[PDB]
Amino acid sequence: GHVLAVPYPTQGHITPFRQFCKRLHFKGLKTTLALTTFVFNSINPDLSGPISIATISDGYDHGGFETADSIDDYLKDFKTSGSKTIADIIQKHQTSDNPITCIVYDAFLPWALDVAREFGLVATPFFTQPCAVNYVYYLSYINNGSLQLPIEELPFLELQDLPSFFSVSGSYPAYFEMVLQQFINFEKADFVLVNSFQELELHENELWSKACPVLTIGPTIPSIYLDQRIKSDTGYDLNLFESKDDSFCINWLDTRPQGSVVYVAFGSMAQLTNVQMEELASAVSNFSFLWVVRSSEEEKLPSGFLETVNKEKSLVLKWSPQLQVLSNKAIGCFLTHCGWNSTMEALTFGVPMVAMPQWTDQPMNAKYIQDVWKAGVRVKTEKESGIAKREEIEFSIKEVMEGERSKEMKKNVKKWRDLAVKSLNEGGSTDTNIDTFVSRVQ
Ligand SMILES: O=c1ccn([C@@H]2O[C@H](COP(=O)(O)OP(=O)(O)O)[C@@H](O)[C@H]2O)c(=O)[nH]1
Ligand SMILES: *[C@@H]1O[C@H](CO)[C@@H](O)[C@H](O)[C@H]1O
Ligand SMILES: O=C(O)c1ccccc1O
């Protein structure tokens, strides 16, 4: 058995795809990971497991996404160039020790099924977003692109709870058509994989599994932090942002008392405005903080803000070893844009969050953080503008550090570590679902 693994070319999709492959290798399955050449020349390959990489093309080997004329051009070029480049990996390996038997492609790339079917291969999409989010999208697809509020099977959800495509009308029309066209052919899939575990959205997994065979194979957080069954899986080893020489960071955090630091980070792709950046900077400077401002975003922090940094309470970085930060006892709360990987990381580490979602599926994750998992609070935004003002930010941070919702939320969230380990340990639902997939593949 041999699996070709095709992530969407961003950090948030690549690392679950890699981590999943480490589990496949642990279970005796050969995997080749298909990176775009733009990405492959942007990686800095320090590994934490055996890795086999094949290169494919999205049609932007030189400049990547930012050189495309439009988002919708990128997707269609990606389909054309990606279909050819993926086919060639399959062809080339046919006469080899292990010809490929299964394509595990990102759900954002449904055309990979066509390629998988043309070579008689097993095909399974891989959803990097939670069951709740995708079931919402699925219900729109079997509709014709909009949704019945309230959702009869999940009626506690409102307009501000939905993905940004619904509440910001007309925004990202091409990206909106992508998340819906995840379902154009998923019927024909041999299985459907989602980077979640059953006990985290037990309800919403059921709803979605009525329509399609869903196999939860998360969480994709490295084995060392949970189940420890995979000795080599110590961290995230395919990173698009250079690694700071990260022990400066983790040494600084063992300097500070337990639960004293506020961690701030917005993922790999989210861009705030100048206005957004000073409201944050003021609210956060009321605290001992660790803030990740990526390099493309230093522009928009206040004039001379990085000088005014109190070096005895707080620190600003271009990027961070987020896994090790969230495992560090000096963190008190995590101010997060609610990217799915970041949310599952904070839940697994028992770090309560201040949710400050920005777009696509982050509003849903923020609702579940506050009202389903009761593991954090959503910051309030002025409705004219969608911007969180410095005092609404500071209010929310204090509610998770000092309020006494704060020690209730503190204990509600520590439930999840042990649930996640149980699913990754022998006989867990995730460990069982991975075995069903491995069974099919050979
Ligand atoms: O400074 C940082 C910020 C983020 N991350 C990692 O980058 C991923 C971010 O993906 P996520 O799903 O949170 O959001 P997206 O980045 O896709 O918008 C997560 O695994 C984080 O652990 C990191 O390692 N250092
Ligand atoms: C879409 O817009 C969000 C905020 O609205 C920004 O974070 C992204 O960079 C952009 O693609
Ligand atoms: O990379 C992501 O996380 C993503 C998620 C939803 C829609 C578009 C995207 O690029």
Numbering used by the authors: 6 to 447
The authors write:
UGT74F1 and UGT74F2 are the enzymes responsible for the in vivo glucosylation of SA in A. thaliana. In UGT74F1, glucose is transferred to the hydroxyl of SA, creating a glucoside; in UGT74F2, glucose is transferred to the carboxylate group of SA to create a glucose ester. UGT74F2 exhibits the GT-B fold with ligands bound in the cleft between the two domains –the N-terminal domain is comprised of residues 1–245, while 246–449 make up the C-terminal domain. UDP and SA interact primarily with residues in the C- and N-terminal domain, respectively.
